[PDB]
Design a protein around this nucleic acid. Structure first.
Ligand SMILES: [Mg+2]
Ligand SMILES: [Mg+2]
Ligand SMILES: [Mg+2]
Ligand SMILES: [Mg+2]
Ligand SMILES: [Mg+2]
Ligand SMILES: [Mg+2]
Ligand SMILES: [Mg+2]
Ligand SMILES: [Mg+2]
Ligand SMILES: [Mg+2]
Ligand SMILES: [Mg+2]
Ligand SMILES: [Mg+2]
Ligand SMILES: [Mg+2]
Ligand SMILES: [Mg+2]
Ligand SMILES: [Mg+2]
Ligand SMILES: [Mg+2]
Ligand SMILES: [Mg+2]
Ligand SMILES: [Mg+2]
Ligand SMILES: [Mg+2]
Ligand SMILES: [Mg+2]
Ligand SMILES: [Mg+2]
Ligand SMILES: [Mg+2]
Ligand SMILES: [Mg+2]
Ligand SMILES: [Mg+2]
Ligand SMILES: [Mg+2]
Ligand SMILES: [Mg+2]
Ligand SMILES: [Mg+2]
Ligand SMILES: [Mg+2]
Ligand SMILES: [Mg+2]
Ligand SMILES: [Mg+2]
Ligand SMILES: [Mg+2]
Ligand SMILES: [Mg+2]
Ligand SMILES: [Mg+2]
Ligand SMILES: [Mg+2]
Ligand SMILES: [Mg+2]
Ligand SMILES: [Mg+2]
Ligand SMILES: [Mg+2]
Ligand SMILES: [Mg+2]
Ligand SMILES: [Mg+2]
Ligand SMILES: [Mg+2]
Ligand SMILES: [Mg+2]
Ligand SMILES: [Mg+2]
Ligand SMILES: [Mg+2]
Ligand SMILES: [Mg+2]
Ligand SMILES: [Mg+2]
Ligand SMILES: [Mg+2]
Ligand SMILES: [Mg+2]
Ligand SMILES: [Mg+2]
Ligand SMILES: [Mg+2]
Ligand SMILES: [Mg+2]
Ligand SMILES: [Mg+2]
Ligand SMILES: [Mg+2]
Ligand SMILES: [Mg+2]
Ligand SMILES: [Mg+2]
Ligand SMILES: [Mg+2]
Ligand SMILES: [Mg+2]
Ligand SMILES: [Mg+2]
Ligand SMILES: [Mg+2]
Ligand SMILES: [Mg+2]
Ligand SMILES: [Mg+2]
Ligand SMILES: [Mg+2]
Ligand SMILES: [Mg+2]
Ligand SMILES: [Mg+2]
Ligand SMILES: [Mg+2]
Ligand SMILES: [Mg+2]
Ligand SMILES: [Mg+2]
Ligand SMILES: [Mg+2]
Ligand SMILES: [Mg+2]
Ligand SMILES: [Mg+2]
Ligand SMILES: [Mg+2]
Ligand SMILES: [Mg+2]
Ligand SMILES: [Mg+2]
Ligand SMILES: [Mg+2]
Ligand SMILES: [Mg+2]
Ligand SMILES: [Mg+2]
Ligand SMILES: [Mg+2]
Ligand SMILES: [Mg+2]
Ligand SMILES: [Mg+2]
Ligand SMILES: [Mg+2]
Ligand SMILES: [Mg+2]
Ligand SMILES: [Mg+2]
Ligand SMILES: [Mg+2]
Ligand SMILES: [Mg+2]
Ligand SMILES: [Mg+2]
Ligand SMILES: [Mg+2]
Ligand SMILES: [Mg+2]
Ligand SMILES: [Mg+2]
Ligand SMILES: [Mg+2]
Ligand SMILES: [Mg+2]
Ligand SMILES: [Mg+2]
Ligand SMILES: [Mg+2]
Ligand SMILES: [Mg+2]
Ligand SMILES: [Mg+2]
Ligand SMILES: [Mg+2]
Ligand SMILES: [Mg+2]
Ligand SMILES: [Mg+2]
Ligand SMILES: [Mg+2]
Ligand SMILES: [Mg+2]
Ligand SMILES: [Mg+2]
Ligand SMILES: [Mg+2]
Ligand SMILES: [Mg+2]
Ligand SMILES: [Mg+2]
Ligand SMILES: [Mg+2]
Ligand SMILES: [Mg+2]
Ligand SMILES: [Mg+2]
Ligand SMILES: [Mg+2]
Ligand SMILES: [Mg+2]
Ligand SMILES: [Mg+2]
Ligand SMILES: [Mg+2]
Ligand SMILES: [Mg+2]
Ligand SMILES: [Mg+2]
Ligand SMILES: [Mg+2]
Ligand SMILES: [Mg+2]
Ligand SMILES: [Mg+2]
Ligand SMILES: [Mg+2]
Ligand SMILES: [Mg+2]
Ligand SMILES: [Mg+2]
Ligand SMILES: [Mg+2]
Ligand SMILES: [Mg+2]
Ligand SMILES: [Mg+2]
Ligand SMILES: [Mg+2]
Ligand SMILES: [Mg+2]
Ligand SMILES: [Mg+2]
Ligand SMILES: [Mg+2]
Ligand SMILES: [Mg+2]
Ligand SMILES: [Mg+2]
Ligand SMILES: [Mg+2]
Ligand SMILES: [Mg+2]
Ligand SMILES: [Mg+2]
Ligand SMILES: [Mg+2]
Ligand SMILES: [Mg+2]
Ligand SMILES: [Mg+2]
Ligand SMILES: [Mg+2]
Ligand SMILES: [Mg+2]
Ligand SMILES: [Mg+2]
Ligand SMILES: [Mg+2]
Ligand SMILES: [Mg+2]
Ligand SMILES: [Mg+2]
Ligand SMILES: [Mg+2]
Ligand SMILES: [Mg+2]
Ligand SMILES: [Mg+2]
Ligand SMILES: [Mg+2]
Ligand SMILES: [Mg+2]
Ligand SMILES: [Mg+2]
Ligand SMILES: [Mg+2]
Ligand SMILES: [Mg+2]
Ligand SMILES: [Mg+2]
Ligand SMILES: [Mg+2]
Ligand SMILES: [Mg+2]
Ligand SMILES: [Mg+2]
Ligand SMILES: [Mg+2]
Ligand SMILES: [Mg+2]
Ligand SMILES: [Mg+2]
Ligand SMILES: [Mg+2]
Ligand SMILES: [Mg+2]
Ligand SMILES: [Mg+2]
Ligand SMILES: [Mg+2]
Ligand SMILES: [Mg+2]
Ligand SMILES: [Mg+2]
Ligand SMILES: [Mg+2]
Ligand SMILES: [Mg+2]
Ligand SMILES: [Mg+2]
Ligand SMILES: [Mg+2]
Ligand SMILES: [Mg+2]
Ligand SMILES: [Mg+2]
Ligand SMILES: [Mg+2]
Ligand SMILES: [Mg+2]
Ligand SMILES: [Mg+2]
Ligand SMILES: [Mg+2]
Ligand SMILES: [Mg+2]
Ligand SMILES: [Mg+2]
Ligand SMILES: [Mg+2]
Ligand SMILES: [Mg+2]
Ligand SMILES: [Mg+2]
Ligand SMILES: [Mg+2]
Ligand SMILES: [Mg+2]
Ligand SMILES: [Mg+2]
Ligand SMILES: [Mg+2]
Ligand SMILES: [Mg+2]
Ligand SMILES: [Mg+2]
Ligand SMILES: [Mg+2]
Ligand SMILES: [Mg+2]
Ligand SMILES: [Mg+2]
Ligand SMILES: [Mg+2]
Ligand SMILES: [Mg+2]
Ligand SMILES: [Mg+2]
Ligand SMILES: [Mg+2]
Ligand SMILES: [Mg+2]
Ligand SMILES: [Mg+2]
Ligand SMILES: [Mg+2]
Ligand SMILES: [Mg+2]
Ligand SMILES: [Mg+2]
Ligand SMILES: [Mg+2]
Ligand SMILES: [Mg+2]
Ligand SMILES: [Mg+2]
Ligand SMILES: [Mg+2]
Ligand SMILES: [Mg+2]
Ligand SMILES: [Mg+2]
Ligand SMILES: [Mg+2]
Ligand SMILES: [Mg+2]
Ligand SMILES: [Mg+2]
Ligand SMILES: [Mg+2]
Ligand SMILES: [Mg+2]
Ligand SMILES: [Mg+2]
Ligand SMILES: [Mg+2]
Ligand SMILES: [Mg+2]
Ligand SMILES: [Mg+2]
Ligand SMILES: [Mg+2]
Ligand SMILES: [Mg+2]
Ligand SMILES: [Mg+2]
Ligand SMILES: [Mg+2]
Ligand SMILES: [Mg+2]
Ligand SMILES: [Mg+2]
Ligand SMILES: [Mg+2]
Ligand SMILES: [Mg+2]
Ligand SMILES: [Mg+2]
Ligand SMILES: [Mg+2]
Ligand SMILES: [Mg+2]
Ligand SMILES: [Mg+2]
Ligand SMILES: [Mg+2]
Ligand SMILES: [Mg+2]
Ligand SMILES: [Mg+2]
Ligand SMILES: [Mg+2]
Ligand SMILES: [Mg+2]
Ligand SMILES: [Mg+2]
Ligand SMILES: [Mg+2]
Ligand SMILES: [Mg+2]
Ligand SMILES: [Mg+2]
Ligand SMILES: [Mg+2]
Ligand SMILES: [Mg+2]
Ligand SMILES: [Mg+2]
Ligand SMILES: [Mg+2]
Ligand SMILES: [Mg+2]
Ligand SMILES: [Mg+2]
Ligand SMILES: [Mg+2]
Ligand SMILES: [Mg+2]
Ligand SMILES: [Mg+2]
Ligand SMILES: [Mg+2]
Ligand SMILES: [Mg+2]
Ligand SMILES: [Mg+2]
Ligand SMILES: [Mg+2]
Ligand SMILES: [Mg+2]
Ligand SMILES: [Mg+2]
Ligand SMILES: [Mg+2]
Lengths: 272, 49
RNA sequence: UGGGAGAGGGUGGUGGAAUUCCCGGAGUAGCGGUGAAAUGCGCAGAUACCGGGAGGAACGCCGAUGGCGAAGGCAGCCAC
RNA sequence: CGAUGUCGGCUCGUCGCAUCCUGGGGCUGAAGAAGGUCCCAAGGGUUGGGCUGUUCGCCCAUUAAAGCGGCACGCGAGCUG
RNA sequence: GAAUGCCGGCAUGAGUAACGAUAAAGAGGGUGAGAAUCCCUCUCGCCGUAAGCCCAAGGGUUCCUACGCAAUGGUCGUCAGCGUAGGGUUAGGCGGGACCUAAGGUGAAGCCGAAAGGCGUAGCCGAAGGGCAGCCGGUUAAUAUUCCGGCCCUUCCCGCAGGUGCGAUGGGGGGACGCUCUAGGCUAGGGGGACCGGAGCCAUGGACGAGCCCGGCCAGAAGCGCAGGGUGGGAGGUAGGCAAAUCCGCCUCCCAACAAGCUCUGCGUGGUGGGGAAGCCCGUACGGGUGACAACCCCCCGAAGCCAGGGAGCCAAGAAAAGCCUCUAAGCACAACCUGCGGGAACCCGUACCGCAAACCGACACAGGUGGGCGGGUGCAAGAGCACUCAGGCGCGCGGGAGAACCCUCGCCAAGGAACUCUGCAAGUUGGCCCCGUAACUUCGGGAGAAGGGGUGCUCCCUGGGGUGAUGAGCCCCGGGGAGCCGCAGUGAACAGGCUCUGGCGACUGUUUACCAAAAACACAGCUCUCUGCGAACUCGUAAGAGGAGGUAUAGGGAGCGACGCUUGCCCGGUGCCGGAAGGUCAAGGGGAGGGGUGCAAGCCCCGAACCGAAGCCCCGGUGAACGGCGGCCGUAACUAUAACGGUCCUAAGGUAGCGAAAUUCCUUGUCGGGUAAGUUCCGACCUGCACGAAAAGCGUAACGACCGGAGCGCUGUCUCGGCGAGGGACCCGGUGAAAUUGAACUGGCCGUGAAGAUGCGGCCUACCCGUGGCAGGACGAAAAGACCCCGUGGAGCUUUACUGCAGCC
RNA sequence: GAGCUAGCCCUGGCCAGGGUGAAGCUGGGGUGAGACCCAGUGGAGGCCCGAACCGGUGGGGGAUGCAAACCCCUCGGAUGA
RNA sequence: UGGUUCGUGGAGCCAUGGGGGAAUCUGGGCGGACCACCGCCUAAGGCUAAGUACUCCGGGUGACCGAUAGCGCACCAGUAC
């Protein structure tokens, strides 16, 4: 839906805030299962290796369930849907009949009080997790494992999904959110449905401060620098570059493909 | 204005102390040189308890 | 009250022909287009044919000089 | 070049005359008034503004006239910048 | 004898500058050999959300006392933060540690590294973060929440008494948290009083009066009373909380749905314990006596503090561990643990003093800097603002005169108001609150404090609301209405915007060249391109490993542009990039046709053609919000003129929209209009664009700007064109007393000359010796081994299709 | 060598007092249901004025200074990047 | 690739990182590409004084200095600062 503001200040005339009506009466999170101390830090053992990070709001990390084959057959009731600061999606807090409480990444259409389960059994319903093989060809799915028993790694951002295209021996063909055509092992678990919070792409940050709240420090152009700091540095009053556009470290940034050619993964990819 | 020397006993001891010098080979060489030179004080005197 | 007709509107599904593209087989001196031709594609192996895959669009005969709506308009079927 | 601060303005002037006006004067195509040119003569005086960093120039209103140049294109151990 | 030589000593300036904030001094009396400066008394001035108090870091004997002035103090000094000597720092409760954990560090296991060494789950260290039991008074010259007095607590150990299955570094709960706005009751604090307690006092015209002026509290167990914070209670089942678990979690039933009850805080009351002003008398460098059997009462304001884990809202979504409670396991149930009461034990370290400053950082008794808490009254609207002033602490460690020029700060001004000038630079106008009333434009919020006008004091009368008192008196806040009074002036003093039009640039809040540039530069939300399928790409690292990220295409990295509105056209010949199992060239390797060297020979050793050989380049294509670029000449219309039209040359293609003499336009003050009396500036247009142009984006854009340009109303010492006054210096006297510079000097002017600019050479002229206040013309004045220029086969920083290499990648 | 300085990480503290009054809610108007419009409440914002506090805009002074970056007036932000 | 005078040179010998990969006296290395003859050695295991280097320390001597010299210090100096 997206919240809008009146221009009672500049930067408030384009600012826009997400709709939190799907956040059930549960704003503060769950102890026990989560939170962990989350270690803010823009750098390695010493050196910054990803520029322009730092600042922004403190965050507690929600240690979510990305491998649902622990509770094969054990159903759970969706107790709540909460805001997760460490990801774009929302998170669903579910109570297993087992008594154990877990968070799943909250798919689109998930309602509070609804029944969800994981396993080869599992009715093909939104929220349920299955090995890819037993899911009907053509249904959309998310939180897809890459290799069996390694954890969900595909389609976890707000409003993303993958669609099952076909099967081929022990593998099923997925069309990933990028549009890549990928061979993924049949035994890989994935949970049916799309991610939801799909209005995430429609939010307008509004001002610089909002960028800072998310820990995103200002990004300065190479043109603004000096030849010591970027081959785009200098020269005189503005400059159109003078060479194929490059990163600070000298590699070209318009077209140069960079995935290594001889990767063993190559014989499982079909598209772009 | 604000000058460069802003004393701190913990900073002085943690930065120039005997144990800090002993922790690395470069500082052990510092203590070796000051000993051979006959320095009365191998490391800065940081006081208080 | 009792019945009748109808592409009335919508949501969710769902079918086949066909187009284009990708993959394999086997096949080679051109295809294409126009009043005439060229651009163009084709010796890096095309058009033609077969097998499978993908996606979008409208709905072939029925179909009518037919029907429905206030109008613009409304067409493969199913349920609500 | 092991130092001679460089345009323009302000302030302080001072010097040369090949004279902008004032005074003397020959000639005049000098009726008179006013002019032209010219010899002698610097004692003094030689406005306030608009434009522009401007020197210079163009204009507005005047005036007897709105002079040219030298003094490290005078003058920053005087000022500005 | 020289090296702007090195070390040391002494001159010069020169008794000159300065004596370190303009908050301020006068007198008198002590002491002393010596008093503007030390002591005491009075008069005066200054600070007072400090220039007063309390903590923290730092400092480290500066604290106190006694004896002293050679040196330190910008002078003096009998003085001190100085010298000599002595003394002073007392804790189970304050702070730190025999408590905990975070970043980070360290680090057994383990991983890596020529070596030194690097990462590294556990554990450990690691703190104004959590946990922890004390308040009030009195005493020293110096310590006190440490010593004493009163009252109150905390742990441990041993004993009896009563209870219970006790019971772990293990399981669970708890601790446990953001920003803004807040309700209820309290406290600190403050205002006050006809009430109480006081030594006193009627002055100078009046006042013996509810007169003046001072003070009217502090802490305090148990039990209480009020406000408040936390919490449901059971009965079954159980597969989860990595063993077990009566605990937790989860499902099903029942009573609560209440904060009733249970604990837990704070605040009043409280057995009881302390303090107790002004004034007067004393001798202190200060404190004591008395006032004192001191009184210790009632209202009002009321916090940002307490009840604090209270409530509500919002997105950007808000530490960890231990102490604490429960649960159980090995073990043990003669243990052990819980409760109550006794007796016993309770360590180590700091404790002085300064602490917005003469004790910390500044070489200095330096106008700079330094975290946190308290920080009173009055009045101006308010408030930590500003003016005065309690408590208190100061007069800034050279004075005295004078009344010059001149410098700085400040005040005023006739008449004119920007004529000054680069430019209203500066300064001046305006200025707080209440009430009316406001345009274009606009993104509908704004522009708005537009502009701009009126009121503002004081007395009396009537009168409406609230809060605390019971539905009332007092009291505390706000108003409304009506008459009057005074001055030039009523936010009367202090703090408290000048106004308007237009354009250029940037959307806007912001960031930046510490120490000359705060901008039109950077950033910014937003838009586009590209890379990247998770052991992701990219980055650091030899590696291990770490970031990316405990993230997964709505995610992450690079690049550019830069809100928003409207839009971003043609050229892929060249470069970059992307896609192309064809062909050409193409290294090592394979292959051996053939030939060579020795040998009596088998043999051994060499070269060595075809032929099979990758990536790359060539070649084929795509791709410009990738690198980039987007023409010329001649002719033609019936007034001339122009050329909608035509022809031709060439390129890969031959700038469309939109703007345009611009932040771009040389000629140029292009040309017309407008602003002026006058307009190389400014604005509106034409287009002949030397040399705009569409994401190094193009054209506009409300608002915004310590950005830049132009113009006007208002106001001025900016100017005609200056004058006067005040003060701190300058100046004279006493006192302490620098500096760079300096070949030596007994150092005139002119006209010449001299290395081309003479005090010193030539000729003439002028000129007694020597000082003081001063102006700057000169001594090519001082200060920097010229920073522009050139040179050196001098150095450094950058980029590239310069050379040759290296990391990295194929 | 990061006790100055730049960035970040962990944990603490601070921002007086005033104005403007977003969304949402309550009532009412209006419809078939709305949208929407009035009030009242409400306390939003890289909100406005402006002390502490963080700055350093313009001018004057200072230039062997109080100061090897200062001083006076003026100026910016001032719940947020 | 390194060492040797040896810098690819006719480039060996000695050591190696790397691919292949023997034998035990009629066995193997070498005599500077290579081959034949003729000669010298017996690798892939370790220990080995002396003669040789130096002067923190002690002693002796000086066509060595004599407080701006001589070690930075003749003196409580690697101190004061
Ligand atoms: Mg590391
Ligand atoms: Mg690092
Ligand atoms: Mg480190
Ligand atoms: Mg998470
Ligand atoms: Mg979410
Ligand atoms: Mg940027
Ligand atoms: Mg730059
Ligand atoms: Mg570069
Ligand atoms: Mg570069
Ligand atoms: Mg530059
Ligand atoms: Mg250029
Ligand atoms: Mg460039
Ligand atoms: Mg170029
Ligand atoms: Mg690709
Ligand atoms: Mg790369
Ligand atoms: Mg590749
Ligand atoms: Mg020169
Ligand atoms: Mg020379
Ligand atoms: Mg000289
Ligand atoms: Mg000179
Ligand atoms: Mg000179
Ligand atoms: Mg000149
Ligand atoms: Mg000049
Ligand atoms: Mg003449
Ligand atoms: Mg005449
Ligand atoms: Mg005449
Ligand atoms: Mg005449
Ligand atoms: Mg004449
Ligand atoms: Mg003359
Ligand atoms: Mg004359
Ligand atoms: Mg003028
Ligand atoms: Mg003018
Ligand atoms: Mg003249
Ligand atoms: Mg002259
Ligand atoms: Mg000249
Ligand atoms: Mg000139
Ligand atoms: Mg001149
Ligand atoms: Mg000057
Ligand atoms: Mg000058
Ligand atoms: Mg001069
Ligand atoms: Mg001067
Ligand atoms: Mg000499
Ligand atoms: Mg000499
Ligand atoms: Mg000589
Ligand atoms: Mg010298
Ligand atoms: Mg002297
Ligand atoms: Mg004197
Ligand atoms: Mg003098
Ligand atoms: Mg003098
Ligand atoms: Mg003097
Ligand atoms: Mg002074
Ligand atoms: Mg006296
Ligand atoms: Mg006396
Ligand atoms: Mg005596
Ligand atoms: Mg402390
Ligand atoms: Mg000190
Ligand atoms: Mg002392
Ligand atoms: Mg004494
Ligand atoms: Mg003394
Ligand atoms: Mg003295
Ligand atoms: Mg002094
Ligand atoms: Mg004394
Ligand atoms: Mg003292
Ligand atoms: Mg002393
Ligand atoms: Mg102990
Ligand atoms: Mg002990
Ligand atoms: Mg401890
Ligand atoms: Mg400990
Ligand atoms: Mg610990
Ligand atoms: Mg850790
Ligand atoms: Mg770390
Ligand atoms: Mg450790
Ligand atoms: Mg380590
Ligand atoms: Mg670690
Ligand atoms: Mg604490
Ligand atoms: Mg404690
Ligand atoms: Mg004391
Ligand atoms: Mg107590
Ligand atoms: Mg128990
Ligand atoms: Mg038990
Ligand atoms: Mg226990
Ligand atoms: Mg626990
Ligand atoms: Mg816990
Ligand atoms: Mg109240
Ligand atoms: Mg009280
Ligand atoms: Mg009170
Ligand atoms: Mg009172
Ligand atoms: Mg009172
Ligand atoms: Mg009495
Ligand atoms: Mg009387
Ligand atoms: Mg009185
Ligand atoms: Mg009273
Ligand atoms: Mg009580
Ligand atoms: Mg109660
Ligand atoms: Mg049970
Ligand atoms: Mg249970
Ligand atoms: Mg268990
Ligand atoms: Mg009480
Ligand atoms: Mg008393
Ligand atoms: Mg005293
Ligand atoms: Mg506070
Ligand atoms: Mg709460
Ligand atoms: Mg709360
Ligand atoms: Mg935790
Ligand atoms: Mg622990
Ligand atoms: Mg047991
Ligand atoms: Mg047992
Ligand atoms: Mg003490
Ligand atoms: Mg003390
Ligand atoms: Mg003090
Ligand atoms: Mg201060
Ligand atoms: Mg302070
Ligand atoms: Mg000071
Ligand atoms: Mg100091
Ligand atoms: Mg002083
Ligand atoms: Mg401060
Ligand atoms: Mg106060
Ligand atoms: Mg006050
Ligand atoms: Mg007062
Ligand atoms: Mg008041
Ligand atoms: Mg006010
Ligand atoms: Mg305060
Ligand atoms: Mg004040
Ligand atoms: Mg006082
Ligand atoms: Mg002084
Ligand atoms: Mg005045
Ligand atoms: Mg005047
Ligand atoms: Mg007047
Ligand atoms: Mg006027
Ligand atoms: Mg003018
Ligand atoms: Mg003038
Ligand atoms: Mg101007
Ligand atoms: Mg001004
Ligand atoms: Mg005024
Ligand atoms: Mg005012
Ligand atoms: Mg003003
Ligand atoms: Mg007024
Ligand atoms: Mg208007
Ligand atoms: Mg108008
Ligand atoms: Mg309207
Ligand atoms: Mg405007
Ligand atoms: Mg408005
Ligand atoms: Mg007004
Ligand atoms: Mg009442
Ligand atoms: Mg009342
Ligand atoms: Mg009046
Ligand atoms: Mg004032
Ligand atoms: Mg104002
Ligand atoms: Mg005005
Ligand atoms: Mg403007
Ligand atoms: Mg324009
Ligand atoms: Mg212009
Ligand atoms: Mg800006
Ligand atoms: Mg603002
Ligand atoms: Mg600067
Ligand atoms: Mg610096
Ligand atoms: Mg600097
Ligand atoms: Mg600099
Ligand atoms: Mg500046
Ligand atoms: Mg600025
Ligand atoms: Mg868009
Ligand atoms: Mg790397
Ligand atoms: Mg790594
Ligand atoms: Mg990683
Ligand atoms: Mg992570
Ligand atoms: Mg992205
Ligand atoms: Mg990016
Ligand atoms: Mg840009
Ligand atoms: Mg658009
Ligand atoms: Mg374009
Ligand atoms: Mg383009
Ligand atoms: Mg285009
Ligand atoms: Mg191309
Ligand atoms: Mg091209
Ligand atoms: Mg090419
Ligand atoms: Mg290619
Ligand atoms: Mg090839
Ligand atoms: Mg070959
Ligand atoms: Mg032969
Ligand atoms: Mg091509
Ligand atoms: Mg004609
Ligand atoms: Mg033509
Ligand atoms: Mg041609
Ligand atoms: Mg055009
Ligand atoms: Mg033009
Ligand atoms: Mg023009
Ligand atoms: Mg004209
Ligand atoms: Mg004109
Ligand atoms: Mg002008
Ligand atoms: Mg044209
Ligand atoms: Mg341009
Ligand atoms: Mg163009
Ligand atoms: Mg472009
Ligand atoms: Mg732009
Ligand atoms: Mg424009
Ligand atoms: Mg624009
Ligand atoms: Mg504009
Ligand atoms: Mg500005
Ligand atoms: Mg700004
Ligand atoms: Mg005006
Ligand atoms: Mg004046
Ligand atoms: Mg004047
Ligand atoms: Mg005159
Ligand atoms: Mg005066
Ligand atoms: Mg004197
Ligand atoms: Mg001469
Ligand atoms: Mg002579
Ligand atoms: Mg002479
Ligand atoms: Mg003199
Ligand atoms: Mg002078
Ligand atoms: Mg002179
Ligand atoms: Mg001279
Ligand atoms: Mg000179
Ligand atoms: Mg030099
Ligand atoms: Mg030199
Ligand atoms: Mg030079
Ligand atoms: Mg030059
Ligand atoms: Mg050369
Ligand atoms: Mg060179
Ligand atoms: Mg360098
Ligand atoms: Mg630092
Ligand atoms: Mg404070
Ligand atoms: Mg509203
Ligand atoms: Mg507000
Ligand atoms: Mg604001
Ligand atoms: Mg503002
Ligand atoms: Mg402000
Ligand atoms: Mg700043
Ligand atoms: Mg300041
Ligand atoms: Mg300033
Ligand atoms: Mg100045
Ligand atoms: Mg302002
Ligand atoms: Mg070699
Ligand atoms: Mg070799
Ligand atoms: Mg050779
Ligand atoms: Mg060789
Ligand atoms: Mg080998
Ligand atoms: Mg050998
Ligand atoms: Mg051989
Ligand atoms: Mg040989
Ligand atoms: Mg051996
Ligand atoms: Mg000597
Ligand atoms: Mg010596």
């Amino acid at each position: 839906a997206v919240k809008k503001f009146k221009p009672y200040t500049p930067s408030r005339r384009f600012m826009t805030v997400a709709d939190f009506s799907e956040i059930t009466k549960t704003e503060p999170e769950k102890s026990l299962v989560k939170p962990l101390k989350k270690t803010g830090g823009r750098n390695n053992q010493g050196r910054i290796t990803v520029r322009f990070r730092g600042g922004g709001h403190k965050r507690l990390y929600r240690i979510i369930d990305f491998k649902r084959w622990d509770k094969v057959g054990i159903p759970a009731k969706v107790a709540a849907i909460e805001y997760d600061p460490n990801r774009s999606a929302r998170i669903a807090l579910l109570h297993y009949v087992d008594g154990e409480k877990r968070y799943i990444i909250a798919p689109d259409g998930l309602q509070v009080g609804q029944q969800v389960v994981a396993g080869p059994d599992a009715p093909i319903q939104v929220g349920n997790a299955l090995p890819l093989r037993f899911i009907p060809v053509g249904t959309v799915v998310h939180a897809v494992e890459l290799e069996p028993k390694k954890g969900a790694k595909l389609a976890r951002a707000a409003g993303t999904s993958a669609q099952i295209q076909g099967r081929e021996g022990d593998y099923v063909i997925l069309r990933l959110p990028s549009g890549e055509l990928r061979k993924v092992h049949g035994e890989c678990y994935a949970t049916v449905g799309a991610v939801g919070n799909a209005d995430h792409k429609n939010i307008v940050l509004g001002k610089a401060g909002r960028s800072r709240w998310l820990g995103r420090r200002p990004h300065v152009r190479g043109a603004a620098m000096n030849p010591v700091d970027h081959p785009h540095g200098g020269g005189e009053g503005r400059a159109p570059r003078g060479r194929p556009p490059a990163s600070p470290w000298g590699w070209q940034t318009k077209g140069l493909k960079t995935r290594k050619r001889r990767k063993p993964s190559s014989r499982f990819i079909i598209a772009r | 204005m604000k000058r460069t020397w802003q004393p701190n006993r913990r900073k002085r001891a943690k930065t120039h102390g005997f144990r800090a010098r002993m922790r690395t080979p470069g500082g052990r060489k510092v203590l070796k040189r000051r000993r051979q030179k006959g320095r009365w004080r191998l490391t800065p005197a940081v006081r208080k308890r």
